[PDB]
Amino acid sequence: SGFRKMAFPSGKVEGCMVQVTCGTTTLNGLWLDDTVYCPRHVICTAEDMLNPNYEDLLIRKSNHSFLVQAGNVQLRVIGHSMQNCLLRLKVDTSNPKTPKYKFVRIQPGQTFSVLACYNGSPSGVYQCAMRPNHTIKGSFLNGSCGSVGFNIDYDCVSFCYMHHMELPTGVHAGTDLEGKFYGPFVDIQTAQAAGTDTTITLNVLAWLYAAVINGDRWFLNRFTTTLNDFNLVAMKYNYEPLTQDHVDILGPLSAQTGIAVLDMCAALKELLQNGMNGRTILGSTILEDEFTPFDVVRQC
């Protein structure tokens, strides 16, 4: 019993973290097979960031231009390519400690683990949801660039994020593993702002189901609301609309608790309307939208 915001075990990823130095900049890289991936802005400086042209910047550099150290061992760069906002550096050695993996583009509301690493060394692991506005609420400090997010399916590792920068709000932006940014953000040190976010309804409901699964049922009621009637409320409170597809997704959870999706949608409407009056759900003051249905199941 119990429900906690967990993370995937990070060992498999740890094995693939390395340090990349270029000029006066050091950040992390990911080393899979003979490739090491890192943010393209590593080649930037105290000034280029201000307004760079990556292509120019790139060819004034070479394989000697980057120092890649794994553990205490230097590594030989022989190739450099650029893929979107990422850098690909080839190396002489195919990592022995390379696990089954694939690259995926995470979709909003899905969640992943982040292994925060400084200087090629892993510092911590935490769980993160991709916000609707394409940012994540992470804990990152300078030098954390190149840290990645991932999910694990059994043995396989799907990589879904690499860290690039921090927005003015203190939230983070990065790319998938083909260097394509999440959101419209670009790698320039210039004003950029997070769009106004919204709450992930499907996740809040799954969370409610978990709570029921976990014995706090205080927020239930015998009422029911329509799919359109609820959405009207959701709109009012900056919640995302519920759709039939999302209702379908919740079905197993509904079944397990014997709690219709719309009823739960009723309970929510009420909670939205009346608050919690100082009550706790799963030891939580406010509705929590960072667990997917899938997460809830894998934990119950």
Binding site: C145, H172, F185, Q189
Partner: peptide
């Protein structure tokens, strides 16, 4: 503005 990490 955006801060690189």
């Amino acid at each position: 503005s955006a801060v690189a990490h």
